[PDB]
Design a binder for these strands. Sequence first.
RNA 1: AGGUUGACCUCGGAUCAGGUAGGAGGACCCGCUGAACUUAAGCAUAUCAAUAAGCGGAGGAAAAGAAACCAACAGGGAUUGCCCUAGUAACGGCGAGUGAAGCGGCAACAGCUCAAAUUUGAAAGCUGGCUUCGGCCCGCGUUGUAAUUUGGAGAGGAUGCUUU
Lengths: 122, 52, 52, 202
Amino acid sequence: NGKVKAGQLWSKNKEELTKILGELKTELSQLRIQKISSSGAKLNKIHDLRKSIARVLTVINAKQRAQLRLFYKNKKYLPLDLRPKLTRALRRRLSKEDASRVLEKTKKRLTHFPQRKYAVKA
Amino acid sequence: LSRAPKYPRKSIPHEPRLDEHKIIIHPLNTEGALKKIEEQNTLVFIVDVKAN
Amino acid sequence: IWRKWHVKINQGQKRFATASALAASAVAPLLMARGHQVSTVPEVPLVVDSAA
Amino acid sequence: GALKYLEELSKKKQSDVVRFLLRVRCWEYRQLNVIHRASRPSRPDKARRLGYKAKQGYVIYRVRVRRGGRKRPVPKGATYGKPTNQGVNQLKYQRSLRATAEERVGRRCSNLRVLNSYWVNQDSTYKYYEVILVDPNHKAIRRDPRINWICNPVHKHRECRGLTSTGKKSRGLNKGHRFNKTRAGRRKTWKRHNTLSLWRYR
RNA sequence: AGGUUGACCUCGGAUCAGGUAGGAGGACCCGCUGAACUUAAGCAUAUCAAUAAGCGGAGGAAAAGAAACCAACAGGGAUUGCCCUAGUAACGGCGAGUGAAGCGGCAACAGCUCAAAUUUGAAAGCUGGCUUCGGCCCGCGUUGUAAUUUGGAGAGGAUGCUUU
């Protein structure tokens, strides 16, 4: 008891995950008093309760972020934590379209005189 | 004018940093605390240093 | 690191030394004096057919 | 257009009309802040030939700099070494006052890039300049191939490194025999000439 | 209504909508600033050295760069680097010393964009906002945003084939 697997958590929604988090936190709070009052094999249980709380928090955060990404899928401005990280310099880099933009005179020259494929007889 | 942002800067609000399970750590089992229990109707707890 | 590690040798002297070593390789006493076990070798210089 | 007439008029700086305009504008710029934004170029032909456009992302800043030489910040204006046969009243800064103006304007607008600058006035105390700056983060700048080279990070603070026009002049980047020591970079050329080269088969 | 009602220009405010800078690192790179020990018998020219220390600013390289070049030849042809030129031409108290460049061979090669012209039979250009994603608005801008031209040319004509 106290070991909650991620597989069962990935199918729950927010309310039962919150309820499970509440019960796990209550058991850990009682078990700390049990630790300071007596010694036993319940230290394994407190370790599993800590890791189960971590798993539940991870799953709740992941589902909330997935829902938010779905909500912000078709919007121009995203929250800064939902924006891709990359590096600061990569984010300041010119976009691919803007870097590939050429002048129209250049475009006419490239349309009518591109680099050709050729060979020279020996 | 007050701010009316086109996007929230933080997508998810933080959970409360100091909830009750973090505030109360464990009761004190020392002989002074055990004296205080029946002498003063007082319980002694070890708590978080940032809790008022 | 700017000690002189490499030695420039004249290409003519390199070719001379290579030709002398090739000529010495055809002298059966010199093979034994260098320590090769060639007592069962049928002929020096030993030429094997390229079909093999 | 009118800009050919403006260029020919700007050549005539000692004519009555141009001296009047220079005098009144010198008074006005002296009353304004040392560095302040200009709403438009006061020399539109000069700004246009230096690369200004009437497009969102181009700004003009006007700056005045104190003219004359340079003083070494030694106590009581004197050195404690070997005699120099000269004072700090005759020390000459190796960059131009135009470059000093460009650097101070760049520090005032750290978000922009200095494109170029031009003289607009002078008096006994100050020389006055107008500096053209480009916003590398503006979409109208980033979409334009004639100018979006300046959005690349290699052009951060060109005026600090001498990559503007006055910087190239002061670094002496010209071709030919008069510029033997400086055309590829003075310090780099010195390092090349003072490098001892030792090959393996020497 | 005209003591009114407005158009502009300049200058401000806002936790206004959206962005951006700072610090680190700094071997190499671009600038600024700048010694002395040393070497000259000593020593204010000089040398160490256009170096160390100090200051500012970049990138994976930087910088330079498509001639206001070299030459004087039967001419070469952007930039960089290696070899050579060459310890040469040249500079230098009372001399200690200092010191390039053109050509030539090679590594590598790549070329271009504006300003100055009236689209004037039509601002043909663009940031942002809202979108049913078709567009529609608020504006910028004629004190000039597109197209066209950059000296190798080009603009106007003529002409008949090619090109996407």
